[PDB]
């Protein structure tokens, strides 16, 4: 009178064992590589077909699991970790996501996202069924093998991060041809230099090329991107620590507060925008559609440097909600993380671990000072960085770098542990 709903659908799903084995990185090489091959093959396989060469996949596994992590609010998961539920909060996602992906797939098949709803053949519905069902479920079971420590943890993270590696840096050097309507031009912005040199005496104009190209845009965007990439490592590496008792310490997690929110913060705005556009003083839009009137236009993000030059006053309105959500609407993620004082306290009691100096019991009041304050520069300024980069134009980076390079950090400290085993030996 929903945990009862788990029973009819649970352990039927395949699962995999844990190893009773001392597996090393050199040994894990392959098992990682498999995941790489699979994901990349999905990336690189599908005028409209030509544009396509240049649609759920991973995204359901993210969104469904995070949604369940939000539904953990109102103490709902305080049913609490036990052998009888030793993974079933995850297991629920394993089916709920699966069916939500199938629903989405059917909805766009009914839409006919590509193709009229019968004349190309109903068999393509079967095709899309198998395609997405297989793809998504295999991808998930990859991430499971990695979390099972045949790898390291999340794969999907690393996967999207690798996609970001390509979709950023590929544009630096890809020698693939482009045409303006002038003749032979190249995708890889940098190397064009060497052919320009054979083309023109006009070195100054060859350099201004680094500042012009409006599509697959000019190097100056890359240079900004590089600078952002370099800088952020400074911020992310910082961390703080407390002594712990049954010469050992608990590292207070810091930018862990940054990890979750920005997805939601960006999404909510983007989606309400989309909604208002579809439903329609509130907002009116020009051709990628963009706002050009109503409140949504006063609200619109002034990404263009032209927007700077035309009016500075507008930008405050965008800042007010975009940053203010980081300031205040984020505060509720104590429940989403499940890391209020009386949550972290419970967790540490399960750990059965206590600090020096004062009582376990009053440690609630002790840690309270640190708990809200973590939300400040630990979170909001990563949004400020994101917007910095985006309005400087760092290519796709104000989403990507934030997670991708953090994952590089995690992989670095793993790489340190294992390869430092090599270096010590």
């Amino acid at each position: 009178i929903f945990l009862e709903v788990i029973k009819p659908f649970c352990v039927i799903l395949p699962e995999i064992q844990k190893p009773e084995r001392k597996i090393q990185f050199k040994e894990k090489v392959l098992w990682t590589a498999i995941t790489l091959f699979i994901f990349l093959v999905c990336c690189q396989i599908p005028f409209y077909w030509m544009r396509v060469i240049l649609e759920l996949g991973i995204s359901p596994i993210v969104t469904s699991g995070l949604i369940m992590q939000l539904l953990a609010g109102a103490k709902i998961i305080e049913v609490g970790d036990t052998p009888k539920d030793r993974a079933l909060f995850n297991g629920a996602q394993k089916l709920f996501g699966m069916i939500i992906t199938i629903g989405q797939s059917i909805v766009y098949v009914m839409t006919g996202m590509y193709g009229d709803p019968s004349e190309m053949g109903a068999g393509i519905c079967l095709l899309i069924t198998i395609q997405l069902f297989v793809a998504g479920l295999i991808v998930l079971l990859l991430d499971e093998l990695l979390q099972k420590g045949y790898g390291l943890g999340s794969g999907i993270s690393l996967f999207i991060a690798t996609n970001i590696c390509e979709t950023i840096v590929w544009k630096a050097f890809s020698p693939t041809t482009v045409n303006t309507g002038r003749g032979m031009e190249f995708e890889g912005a940098i190397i064009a230099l060497f052919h320009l040199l054979a083309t023109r005496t006009d070195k100054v104009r060859a350099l201004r090329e680094a500042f012009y190209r409006q599509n697959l845009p000019n190097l100056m965007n890359l240079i900004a991107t590089i600078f952002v990439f370099a800088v952020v490592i400074y911020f992310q590496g910082f961390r703080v620590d407390l002594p712990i008792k049954s010469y050992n310490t608990y590292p207070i997690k810091l930018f862990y507060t940054s990890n979750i929110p920005i997805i939601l913060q960006s999404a909510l705005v983007s989606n309400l925008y989309v909604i208002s556009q579809m439903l329609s003083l509130l907002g009116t839009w020009s051709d990628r559609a963009y706002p050009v009137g109503g409140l949504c236009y006063y609200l619109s993000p002034p990404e263009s440097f032209g927007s700077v030059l035309e009016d500075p006053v507008h930008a405050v309105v965008y800042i007010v909600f975009m940053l203010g959500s980081c300031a205040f609407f984020s505060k509720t993620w104590i429940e989403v993380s499940g890391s209020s004082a009386k949550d972290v306290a419970k967790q540490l009691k399960e750990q059965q671990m206590v600090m020096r100096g004062h009582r376990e019991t009053s440690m609630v009041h002790e840690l309270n000072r640190y708990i809200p304050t973590a939300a400040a520069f630990g979170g909001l300024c990563i949004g400020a960085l994101s917007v910095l980069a985006d309005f400087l134009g760092a290519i796709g980076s104000g989403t990507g770098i934030l997670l991708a390079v953090t994952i590089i950090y995690q992989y670095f400290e793993i790489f340190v542990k294992e390869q430092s085993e090599v270096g010590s030996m």
């Binding site: 995999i16 392959l30 098992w31 498999i34 995941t35 091959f37 699979i38 093959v41 396989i45 599908p46 393509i124 095709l127 198998i130 395609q131 297989v134 793809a135 295999i138 079971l141 990859l142 093998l145 045949y150």
Partner: peptide
């Protein structure tokens, strides 16, 4: 042992559908 053939084999075989389509 078999996880490699679990996760890879069916997918690389599932190439065939778009091979013909």
């Amino acid at each position: 042992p078999v996880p490699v053939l679990v996760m890879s084999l069916l997918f690389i075989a599932s190439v065939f559908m778009l091979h013909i389509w």
